[PDB]
Each structure stands twice: as structure tokens, then as C-alpha cells.
Design a protein around this motif. Structure first.
Motif, short mmCIF file in Angstrom:
data_model
loop_
_atom_site.label_atom_id
_atom_site.label_comp_id
_atom_site.label_asym_id
_atom_site.label_seq_id
_atom_site.Cartn_x
_atom_site.Cartn_y
_atom_site.Cartn_z
N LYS A 31 0.81 -1.24 0.00
CA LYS A 31 0.00 0.00 0.00
C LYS A 31 0.83 1.27 0.00
N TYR A 32 2.08 1.17 0.44
CA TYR A 32 2.94 2.33 0.55
C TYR A 32 3.68 2.50 -0.78
N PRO A 33 4.25 3.69 -1.04
CA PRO A 33 4.92 3.90 -2.32
C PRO A 33 6.11 2.97 -2.48
N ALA A 490 20.87 2.08 10.19
CA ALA A 490 19.87 3.00 9.65
C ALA A 490 18.46 2.41 9.64
N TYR A 491 18.36 1.09 9.50
CA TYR A 491 17.09 0.37 9.56
C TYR A 491 16.43 0.57 10.92
N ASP A 492 15.13 0.88 10.89
CA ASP A 492 14.37 1.10 12.13
C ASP A 492 12.99 0.44 12.20
N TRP A 493 12.59 -0.37 11.21
CA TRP A 493 11.28 -1.04 11.23
C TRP A 493 11.14 -1.98 12.45
N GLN A 494 12.22 -2.69 12.76
CA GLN A 494 12.36 -3.46 14.00
C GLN A 494 13.66 -3.03 14.68
N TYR A 560 12.84 -12.27 8.46
CA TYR A 560 11.41 -12.26 8.13
C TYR A 560 10.75 -11.27 9.10
N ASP A 561 10.95 -9.99 8.80
CA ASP A 561 10.74 -8.93 9.79
C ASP A 561 9.30 -8.43 9.91
N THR A 562 8.35 -9.16 9.32
CA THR A 562 6.95 -9.06 9.72
C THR A 562 6.36 -10.41 10.15
N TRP A 563 7.15 -11.49 10.13
CA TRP A 563 6.68 -12.83 10.48
C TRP A 563 7.22 -13.21 11.86
N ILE A 694 1.83 -11.81 5.74
CA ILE A 694 2.16 -11.64 4.32
C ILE A 694 3.45 -12.37 3.90
N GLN A 695 4.48 -12.31 4.74
CA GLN A 695 5.77 -12.95 4.39
C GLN A 695 5.67 -14.47 4.26
N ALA A 696 4.82 -15.10 5.06
CA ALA A 696 4.52 -16.53 4.86
C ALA A 696 3.94 -16.84 3.47
N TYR A 753 4.88 -8.03 -6.90
CA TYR A 753 6.16 -8.09 -6.19
C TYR A 753 6.31 -7.15 -5.02
N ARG A 754 7.36 -7.40 -4.24
CA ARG A 754 7.80 -6.45 -3.22
C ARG A 754 9.30 -6.27 -3.36
N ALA A 755 9.70 -5.01 -3.51
CA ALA A 755 11.08 -4.53 -3.49
C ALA A 755 11.92 -5.03 -4.66
#
Ligand SMILES: OC[C@H]1O[C@@H](O[C@H]2[C@H](O)[C@@H](O)[C@H](O)O[C@@H]2CO)[C@H](O)[C@@H](O)[C@@H]1O
Ligand SMILES: [Ca+2]
Length: 769
Positions: A31-33, A490-494, A560-563, A694-696, A753-755
Motif C-alpha cells: 500500500k505504501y509507495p 539506519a534500519y528502524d522497522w524493527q 522475516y521482519d513481519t513474520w 504476508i511474508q509466509a 512483487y515487493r522490493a
């Protein structure tokens, strides 16, 4: 097509028609750009850390990675090859830009655009690509081979900001034909990095290098300023004289005009005015043109080389740091060296072609391997150059012995050397450029005991966390928007300081890099040994229940940073077991007896408990405490995969590993879209995809290629290649989703796709160990 016989395109080259429309193309599924530059892509030109230029299969110079770490997709319409042909006896000739499109506005309207469909093919086997031009209005057939000198075990030419365009022209007809080939280029100084007056002071000069048997004519497109800044430097295009061709040029045409200043000359007889003019521009964009003209008799072939260089010596990152690029070691740092680079290429391209052939040959000549596998193996390497690659030769204002390096995880998640990803994606570096690989790992070693107590907001939950904890390996070495190599994580999602895979993956990478470079580099093991011990000792503290294994915390505390994982996971648990076994072996090599004993004790306890907690009779459970703990995870035995590569033997029973791999192929591959799209990450024991996250429900391209290598080592040859085939198909095939030269992290069952432009699928090279 009579030109293909006169050149040597390998059968495994990826192919597409010039001007071909692709109907099936995928798009981002979030959903995000998210970047979606279309399927109009090509193999990149440019060396490691040089900045790269993506010339697409339609002929346009369109995907600009000259600003290091950034992706800018825009066609610079002045940058082209064009052709003039006139048959002897005809009144007029014809002229045509070799670009399957036209500009959006009125600039260059005089030029002949819209190279027609079904009149030529594009071919790619990175670092080479080709175009053939087989057009019913061009009696002389033409082809070009374009490349940069990307050469394993070579850290010099591999860095160069240069491309060669080796043209072949053949006359199959029964009449003499006059032919001209013209290279046009915009003076692009100010294209990026210049906040105001973007063309002002740009000027073009012509260089004629007339030394016996090696005449070169080139345009050097620079700026009157001698300032040493990210935006300033030079572009050069040029050509080497060969027998039977004459060279003409035009130093200055206006790109922000109708282009007829140039085109009226070229379209008449294929010969330019030879007008030098160093007058700087003010507001108008300007460009230069280099052309050759020759007569081909019936049955005659001729070869002529052009080149392009760009001397933009300084890269700037968003945090303010300015660094020199690697190639400056070889040509200088003042940004006035584009001709020198061009000249080296024009005088040595035949040698470079042979060096490329010499490295490709062992794989290409192996007739046991299918073409499609070769297509993917070579073309996935595009990302080593196209992944925002940074390779420094000093800070501006600064000498050190080493040259720091960084490859992005991807552009959407703009972090250098994302370690949980490079565990998969760094195989080509260890295998083909191991001095870079070891430098990157020493970079990580140096960060182990860095502490940064300042706090950041964690994206997933809004909680505050410490930036960098002593003894925890960082997620990444910063962002191109901030300070690569200086400000890490620099990563901050987790919060990566509580991740359960990074410290184990770090140790496994270290031991891998020793094993795959011949088990000789004791000093690399010595350099990294304290960090290895620290990393494992810190991870041991995360064992909450004294089963000898770190506990996943019911959140996404790994790649797997949303799983979310909870308790003992197959993934982090197996990685831990393998890292302990690697550290035991390093301890033996370095004669650190107490380390050997400690890590051996930990390994035996953990191995026993891993087996008891997770082995269910058919596969290893996803984890011990989650809602869908009995899901079949494609990557469940990642630690054993690396153990095979590192020659550490069985960390789990051979029989159980074989059963688990067969289950994964039977379910995650064969029950996901008939096994034609890779391995889906999570499947329920009932054969339906796991919907917990989603990652699963994603296939991860790099996970799938790595799983294929695991299957291959374990003798599951058909399964290995069938599993990898789905990734190849989706990426490259007419029936896929059009991801060539932008392989994504992931796709879902719909193929979206993603990324795009992702490091992880470089793991295909693990299939060559
Ligand atoms: O930041 C990298 C990280 O992004 C994750 O997506 C997030 C996104 O960052 C956030 O802005 C948006 O609101 O939520 C999504 C989650 O749905 C992505 O899932 C990660 O894989 C990635 O590492
Ligand atoms: Ca535990």
C-alpha cells in the motif's frame, strides 16, 4: 537476420525484441509507495562503485544510478546511436535513431524516432549485452556488443566508469552501401547534485589523439569550473579509427532545441561538420556527436569500437560525507580525466572481451547445465554493479590501506550491506571478488563493540530503543541518505539489537569466507575472532528457558521482519547450531582450546534440544510457541544449508534433513502454483499457504535459490533445478512478470512483487559452490 552469424552471442543470452511490448508485467503488492520503473530495462554499464547507467532493450539510456545509492529512471533522449545508409545509385539515404520510442516534448523533434518493431533484438549475458538491427529499410545489417570490464579477481578494471560499444556492420546485398554510425551524448554535468544554474558553464571540447596506428577522436563534456564537488566532472564519448572508416564530429549541438543543428548534417550524407566550439552554455542543454562513415561493398564486414566514460570522482551521501570513488586510484581525483579512461578502453577492449570470455567459459561450456540456469546465473550479477554500490578511495579532505565497500540491500529499503540479506546475497563476492568480501566482513567485525545509547522509534510498534548495543552485530552499515560506514543501523522497522539471526549469520559468514577462499587465511580468522566469540556469547544470553538456544520473542526478531517467531525456531535455531559448530572449528584453527570446549558443549546441548523440540517425524516445526508452530517453512534448515557449504558435516540427522527437503519440495514448491513460481515461505500441513503474515505467503527469490543449492548438495538434483526454474521463469521468461534486471525480494501467488532490485537473489551463486 544475417548479422548474427558475424558476431558471437551465446545461446544462453536473455533475449527480447527491440520495441517489444510485454503484457504480463507485475507491480508492487504493498500500500505504501514502492519503486516500479516498468519492464523497459537492460543490463547496466559501469564498474563497481563507478555509478551505473542502465541502457534498456529499447536503446535508451534510462536507469541512472550515477548518484550513488539513488535510482532515477528517466530517458535522456539526446543519448543515442543513430544510423545513416545510402545505396549507391539512389538519390537520398535514410537516417534513423536506434531507439524504439520518441521524446515526450518537442526537443529533438527533427531526429527520426520510433525505431520500428520486429526489426531487431536485444540480448544480455551480463556483463555483455547486444543489439541487432535487421530492418527492411537498412540494407546493411548492424550489431553492437556493449560491456564494461567486470572481471572476477580483478579490482582495477572492474571499478572503471566506462563502457565499450563494439559495432559490426555487414552488407548482404549486391550493391555498395554508404553507412554512418553516430553516437550522441548530452553534457550531463548538473543532471544531479547541482541545486541551481544546472547547465551553466557546461562546455564541450574535441580531443584528437593521433599516435601511429591508434587514432582516437573524442568529445569531452565538462564544466568551466575547477570546483571539486559531487556534481562536477566530465563525460566523454569517442571512437577509434579503423581501416576503411572516416571519423567526423560535432562538438556542440543544443539538446533543449529541435536538434536540427546536428540532424540536418547527419541525415544528408552521414557526415558531420567537424566544428569545434568550446563556448560554454548558460541555460540551454548541450551535447556532442561522434560519427564514423564508411562504404561497404557486397559481402563486406567491418568492426568499429566506440566508448563512453564518466569521470565524476566524488560521491556525496545525504548526511554530508563526500568520498572519492574507487576508480580515482587509477586515473586521479580532479574530475578532468574522462579522456584517459576512454582511451584505455578503446585501446584495450579486445583484451577485456577475452578476460570476460575466460571467466564465463567454464560455466558456458558445461553442457550438463541447461541454458536457462546460465541465463539466470550471469544476469543476476547485474546487481553487483546496479545495487547502489559504494567503494571509497578516501574521504574528501582526508590515506588508509583499505577501501570500504557497500552494496545496498535494495533501493526501497536503502541500507548498505544488510547482513541478514547478505547471508544469502554475498555469494558472488566471496566466490569472485573475495578481497571485497573480506573487507566488508572486517567492517562488520569493527562494529561489534560499538555502543550508541541514543534512542530511535521502532517503526513496527512505536517503542523507543537503543540505536546500537555492545556485542550485537548491526543490521546494516547505514543509508545513502545518511552516513554509510559511519552511522550504522539506519534500519528502524524493527530493533536489530534483539535479532536472533544476525549474530549467528555473522559468524557463519566469517567461517564461509575462510572456507571458500581455500582455508588459508588465518589472519582473517585472527582479525575477526574476538567479534565471533562476543557475538555468540551475547546471543547465548537470549536463551530464556535454559534449553541452550536463544528464544525468539513472539515478534519479528529476524530477517522475516513481519513474520513473528516464538521460542525455539527452526530458522534461528538451526543457524545457532551451525554458528556454534563454525566457532568450534575456528577455535581449533587458532588453537583457542577453551573456546573450542565451550562452543562444543553449547552445541551438543542445543543440538539435542533442537531435535527434541522441533522434529515431528516429517519435517522440523516452524517454532515451539507460535499459533502456526507446525507450518512448513521453506528456510527451516538454513543452518544445515550453510553447514554443507562450510563442510561442517551433519548438524541434524541426514535422514531427517532429506525428509524435510522432500516435504518442502512436495508442499512449499509443488502445492504453490504447480511449482512454477519458487518456494512459498510458509505452508500449513494441510497443503494451504500459511496466512499468519504476508511474508509466509511470499516466495523469496533469494531464499528459493539458496534452497535449490541445498537440494543440489543433498543429491536432489531434479528438485533443485525445478525449484530454481520457477524463479528464472518469473524473472526472465515470456510467461513471467517482467523482472529482468530488477529481481525483487518477493512475489505473491498473483506474481506481483515487493522490493524490485534486491540483493538476496544473488544467492543463485550458491548453486556453483
Ligand atoms: O523499513 C523496511 C521494512 O519495511 C516494512 O514495511 C513497512 C513499512 O516500512 C512501513 O512504512 C509501513 O507502514 O508498514 C510496512 C509493513 O506493512 C517491510 O514489511 C519490511 O520487510 C522492511 O524491511
Ligand atoms: Ca531457549
Amino acid at each position: 537476420d544475417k548479422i548474427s552469424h558475424k558476431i558471437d552471442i551465446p545461446d544462453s543470452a536473455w533475449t527480447i525484441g527491440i520495441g517489444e511490448k510485454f503484457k504480463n508485467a507485475g507491480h508492487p503488492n504493498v500500500k505504501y509507495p514502492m519503486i516500479d520503473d516498468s519492464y523497459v530495462q537492460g543490463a547496466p554499464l559501469g564498474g563497481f562503485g563507478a555509478g551505473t547507467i542502465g541502457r534498456t532493450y529499447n536503446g535508451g539510456f534510462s536507469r541512472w544510478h550515477l548518484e550513488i545509492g539513488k535510482n532515477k529512471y528517466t530517458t535522456v533522449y539526446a543519448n543515442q546511436f543513430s544510423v545513416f545508409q545510402k545505396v549507391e545509385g539512389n538519390k537520398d539515404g535514410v537516417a534513423q535513431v536506434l531507439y524504439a520510442g520518441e521524446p515526450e516534448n518537442g526537443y529533438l523533434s527533427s531526429w527520426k524516432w520510433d525505431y520500428p518493431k520486429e526489426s531487431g533484438m536485444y540480448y544480455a549475458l551480463y556483463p555483455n549485452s547486444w543489439y541487432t538491427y535487421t530492418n527492411k529499410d537498412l540494407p546493411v545489417q548492424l550489431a553492437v556488443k556493449q560491456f564494461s570490464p567486470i572481471i572476477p579477481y580483478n579490482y582495477k578494471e572492474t571499478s572503471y566508469p566506462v563502457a565499450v560499444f563494439k559495432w559490426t556492420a555487414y552488407n548482404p546485398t549486391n550493391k555498395n552501401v554508404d553507412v554512418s554510425i553516430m553516437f550522441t551524448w548530452q553534457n550531463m554535468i548538473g543532471f544531479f547534485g547541482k541545486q541551481v544554474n544546472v547547465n551553466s558553464g557546461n562546455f564541450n571540447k574535441i580531443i584528437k589523439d593521433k599516435s601511429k596506428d591508434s587514432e582516437i577522436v573524442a568529445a569531452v563534456m565538462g564544466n568551466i569550473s575547477n570546483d571539486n564537488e559531487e556534481w562536477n566532472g566530465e563525460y566523454s564519448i569517442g571512437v577509434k579509427k579503423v581501416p576503411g572508416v572516416d571519423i567526423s564530429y560535432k562538438a556542440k549541438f543544443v539538446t533543449t532545441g529541435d536538434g536540427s543543428d546536428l540532424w540536418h548534417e547527419f541525415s544528408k550524407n552521414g557526415i558531420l561538420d567537424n566544428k569545434d566550439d568550446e563556448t560554454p552554455t548558460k541555460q540551454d542543454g548541450i551535447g556532442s556527436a561522434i560519427a564514423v562513415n564508411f562504404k561497404l561493398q557486397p559481402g563486406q564486414t567491418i568492426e568499429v569500437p566506440f566508448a563512453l566514460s564518466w569521470d565524476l570522482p566524488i560521491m556525496k551521501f545525504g548526511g554530508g560525507d563526500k568520498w572519492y570513488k574507487m576508480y580515482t586510484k587509477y586515473f586521479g581525483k580532479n574530475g578532468k580525466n574522462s579522456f584517459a579512461i576512454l582511451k584505455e578502453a578503446l585501446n584495450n577492449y579486445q583484451k577485456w572481451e577475452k578476460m570476460i570470455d575466460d571467466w564465463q567459459k567454464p560455466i558456458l561450456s558445461n553442457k550438463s547445465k541447461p541454458d536457462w540456469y546460465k541465463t539466470a546465473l550471469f544476469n543476476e550479477l547485474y546487481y553487483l554493479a546496479d545495487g547502489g554500490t559504494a567503494w571509497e578511495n578516501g574521504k574528501v579532505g582526508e590515506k588508509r590501506t583499505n577501501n570500504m565497500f557497500g552494496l545496498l540491500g535494495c533501493f526501497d529499503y536503502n541500507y548498505y550491506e544488510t547482513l541478514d540479506v547478505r547471508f544469502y546475497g554475498s555469494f558472488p563476492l566471496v566466490m569472485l571478488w573475495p578481497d571485497i568480501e573480506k573487507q566488508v566482513m572486517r567492517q562488520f567485525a569493527d562494529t561489534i563493540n560499538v555502543q550508541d545509547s541514543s534512542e530511535f522509534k521502532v517503526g513496527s510498534n512505536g517503542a523507543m530503543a537503543v540505536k546500537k548495543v555492545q556485542g550485537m552485530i548491526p543490521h546494516d552499515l547505514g543509508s545513502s541518505y545518511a552516513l554509510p560506514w559511519i552511522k550504522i543501523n539506519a534500519y528502524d522497522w524493527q530493533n536489530p539489537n534483539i535479532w536472533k539471526d544476525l549474530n549467528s549469520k555473522y559468524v557463519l559468514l566469517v567461517y564461509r569466507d575462510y572456507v571458500l577462499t581455500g582455508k588459508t587465511d588465518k589472519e582473517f580468522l585472527k582479525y575477526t575472532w574476538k567479534s565471533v566469540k562476543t557475538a555468540l556469547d551475547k546471543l547465548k544470553e537470549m536463551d530464556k528457558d535454559n534449553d541452550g538456544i536463544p528464544d525468539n520473542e513472539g515478534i519479528p526478531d529476524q530477517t522475516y521482519d513481519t513474520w513473528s517467531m516464538k521460542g525455539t525456531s527452526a530458522y534461528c535455531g538451526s543457524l545457532w547450531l551451525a554458528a556454534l559448530k563454525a566457532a568450534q572449528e575456528i577455535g581449533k584453527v587458532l588453537k583457542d582450546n577453551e573456546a573450542y570446549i565451550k562452543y562444543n558443549e553449547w552445541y551438543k546441548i542445543a543440538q539435542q534440544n533442537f531435535e527434541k523440540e522441533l522434529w515431528n517425524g516429517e519435517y522440523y516445526n516452524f517454532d515451539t510457541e507460535s499459533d502456526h508452530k507446525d507450518s512448513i517453512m521453506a528456510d527451516q534448515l538454513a543452518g544445515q544449508w550453510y553447514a554443507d557449504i562450510l563442510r561442517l558435516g551433519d548438524i541434524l540427522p541426514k535422514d531427517h534433513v532429506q525428509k524435510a527437503l522432500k516435504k518442502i519440495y512436495e508442499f512449499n514448491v509443488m502445492k504453490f502454483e504447480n511449482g512454477k513460481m519458487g518456494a512459498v515461505n510458509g505452508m500449513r500441513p494441510d497443503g494451504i499457504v500459511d496466512e499468519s503474515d504476508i511474508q509466509a505467503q511470499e516466495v523469496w527469490t533469494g531464499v528459493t535459490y539458496a534452497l535449490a543449492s541445498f537440494m543440489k548438495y543433498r543429491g536432489m538434483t531434479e528438485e533443485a533445478y525445478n525449484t530454481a526454474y520457477g524463479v528464472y521463469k518469473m524473472t526472465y521468461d515470456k510467461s513471467g512478470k517482467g523482472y529482468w534486471f530488477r529481481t525483487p525480494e518477493a512475489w505473491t501467488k498473483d506474481g506481483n512483487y515487493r522490493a524490485s532490485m534486491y540483493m538476496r537473489p544473488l544467492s543463485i551463486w550458491s548453486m556453483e559452490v
